[PDB]
Design a protein around this ligand. Structure first.
Ligand SMILES: *[C@@H]1O[C@H](CO)[C@@H](O[C@@H]2O[C@H](CO)[C@@H](O[C@@H]3O[C@H](CO[C@H]4O[C@H](CO[C@H]5O[C@H](CO)[C@@H](O)[C@H](O)[C@@H]5O)[C@@H](O)[C@H](O[C@H]5O[C@H](CO)[C@@H](O)[C@H](O)[C@@H]5O)[C@@H]4O)[C@@H](O)[C@H](O[C@H]4O[C@H](CO)[C@@H](O)[C@H](O)[C@@H]4O[C@H]4O[C@H](CO)[C@@H](O)[C@H](O)[C@@H]4O)[C@@H]3O)[C@H](O)[C@H]2NC(C)=O)[C@H](O)[C@H]1NC(C)=O
Ligand SMILES: *[C@@H]1O[C@H](CO)[C@@H](O[C@@H]2O[C@H](CO)[C@@H](O)[C@H](O)[C@H]2NC(C)=O)[C@H](O)[C@H]1NC(C)=O
Ligand code: NAG
Lengths: 91, 324
């Protein structure tokens, strides 16, 4: 099954345009957001800031990254984030 | 060319480091170990401790299997970036970093049956929720929780070795006012939004030593309130002398209340040190109002000459036994 997952991932990443967003010329992609607050460290008055640690999480739909043979969710490595389109969220 | 070159070039062809071993077969069983070098300072105002370890992980990868006379491929950190490594992160670490001088301090050894050992050097500022009640006579159990970030329980299962946790000499440890009492390792499954994750915890039992605060705030305050009790030996007609002694004692009791609070963080509840400071302050304030009442009566000194040393002497038997 490893060869099937291998050829499916190689099929997904081939021809994937990093510069274009899902539905680049189509409708705005909906990005759902979950935040798990881990801790708040330094609510400082002298610097007028607070330090916040969180498990920031985003979820959208890319129709290029769709597969049909494999019935389980693929948790890939963290180094494929440089190959997949991600939203440009900032604070 | 040679022997190890063709072995490595045959292992790494057709290899995807994105996919974990047995991606659609079974969870990857990872045996972790650790070797603490020197538990660093336990910071109480910021609520964390520093730890330096040799974090080592062991798993099986069937793609890294070779048949030759060579048993172990002892490699440096250059081969880390080519193979799969579990994304082990420390769940209570505020800030951590590996060591990168003169070379990345990582080890990678591959056996011929697919067994991979991966050891790296880490310095971790892990969060310990130190309860400062009882302080400066506190005792704490500081945890070190780690788990995989992205892979749930169905994909990576961590496990402990029997003698995994290895401490050092316990004297190069910069623990100054504390003392490592012992260690205990546990494992559990947490449930988060993404899924269920196997969490491995190491508890470090630390018990404090008050020798420092004795010379910081205890002795110092006790000698000030002993200096409060000599006013009774001064004659009652010497009014500016005894009121100068009184005002100096109360202003320096306020000063030592302010100074000893600088070591403590900005918590709301009261500590035993603050309770001792408050008892000394109300003792010296009672001494001043007793002298004042005597002065207004003459316009009981011997009575206090015994009562005020004795009330603190029974208090210290009450205070130290109940907190120790
Ligand atoms: C936002 O922007 C910032 C800045 O651009 C991004 O951070 C940067 O991220 C990149 C990519 O990960 C890093 O590049 C890699 O760095 C490591 C070494 O990292 C150490 O050195 C860093 C440099 O230190 C400078 O500053 C200090 C200041 O005191 C000076 O003393 C130094 O002299 C330097 O001037 C240092 O910044 C790092 O600390 C930071 O990161 C650590 C992470 O663990 C934190 O704890 C720290 O708190 C701090 O944030 C750290 O000390 C290199 O080793 C990398 O090179 C290897 O990997 C490459 C990718 O695989 C590969 O191409 C290279 O060939 C090389 O590979 C070798 O080593 C691998 C190790 O396993 C092997 O596997 C491999 O086979 C091979 O042998 C790489 O250069 C930047 O250093 C980093 N910089 C900073 C400032 O953080 C950030 O990611 C951006 N954020 C987002 C979300 O976009
Ligand atoms: C892949 O992850 C999705 C996350 O949504 C899982 O789908 C959900 O499964 C739960 C539990 O049965 C259902 O209550 C939800 O309605 C499902 N959500 C959606 C949007 O379909 C799915 O089970 C995961 N697959 C595997 C193999 O783990
Ligand atoms: C902790 O280490 C001991 C070592 O003997 C091991 O038996 C145990 O399984 C490990 N973790 C737990 C509590 O499961």
């Amino acid at each position: 099954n490893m060869s099937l997952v291998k050829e499916t991932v190689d099929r997904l990443l081939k021809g994937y345009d990093i510069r274009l967003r899902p539905d680049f010329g189509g409708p705005p992609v909906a990005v759902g957001m979950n935040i798990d607050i881990a801790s708040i460290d330094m609510v400082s008055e002298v610097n007028m800031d607070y330090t916040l640690t969180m498990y920031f999480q985003q979820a959208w739909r890319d129709k290029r990254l769709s597969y049909n043979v494999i019935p389980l969710n693929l948790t890939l490595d963290n180094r494929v984030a440089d190959q997949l389109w991600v939203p440009d969220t900032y604070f | 060319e040679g022997d190890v070159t063709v072995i490595l070039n045959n292992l790494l062809e057709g290899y995807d480091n994105k996919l974990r071993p047995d991606i659609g077969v079974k969870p990857t069983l990872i045996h972790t170990d650790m070797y603490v070098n020197s538990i660093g300072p336990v910071n109480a105002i910021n609520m964390e401790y520093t730890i330096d370890i040799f974090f080592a992980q062991t798993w099986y990868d069937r793609r890294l299997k070779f048949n030759s006379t060579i048993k172990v491929l002892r490699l440096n950190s250059n081969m880390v970036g080519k193979i799969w490594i579990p994304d082990t992160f420390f769940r209570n670490s505020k800030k951590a970093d590996a060591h990168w001088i003169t070379t990345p301090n990582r080890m990678l050894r591959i056996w011929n049956d697919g067994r991979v050992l991966y050891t790296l050097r880490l310095t971790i500022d892990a969060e310990c929720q130190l309860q400062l009640h009882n302080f400066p006579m506190d005792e704490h159990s500081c945890p070190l929780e780690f788990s995989s970030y992205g892979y749930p329980r169905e994909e990576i299962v961590y496990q402990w070795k029997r003698s995994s946790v290895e401490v050092g000499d316990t004297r190069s440890w910069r623990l100054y006012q504390f003392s490592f009492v012992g260690l205990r390792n546990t494992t559990e499954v947490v449930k988060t939004t993404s899924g269920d994750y196997v969490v491995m915890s190491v508890y470090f039992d630390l018990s404090r030593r008050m020798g420092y605060f004795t010379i910081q705030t205890y002795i110092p305050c006790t000698l000030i309130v002993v200096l409060s009790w000599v006013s009774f030996w001064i004659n009652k007609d010497a009014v500016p002398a005894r009121t100068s002694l009184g005002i100096t004692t109360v202003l320096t009791m306020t000063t030592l209340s302010t100074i000893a609070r600088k070591s403590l963080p900005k918590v709301s509840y009261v500590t035993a040190m603050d309770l001792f400071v408050s008892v000394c302050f109300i003792f010296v304030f009672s001494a001043l109002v007793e002298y004042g009442t005597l002065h207004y009566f003459v316009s009981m000194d011997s009575y206090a000459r015994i009562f005020f040393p004795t009330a603190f002497c029974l208090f210290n038997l009450v205070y130290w036994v109940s907190y120790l």
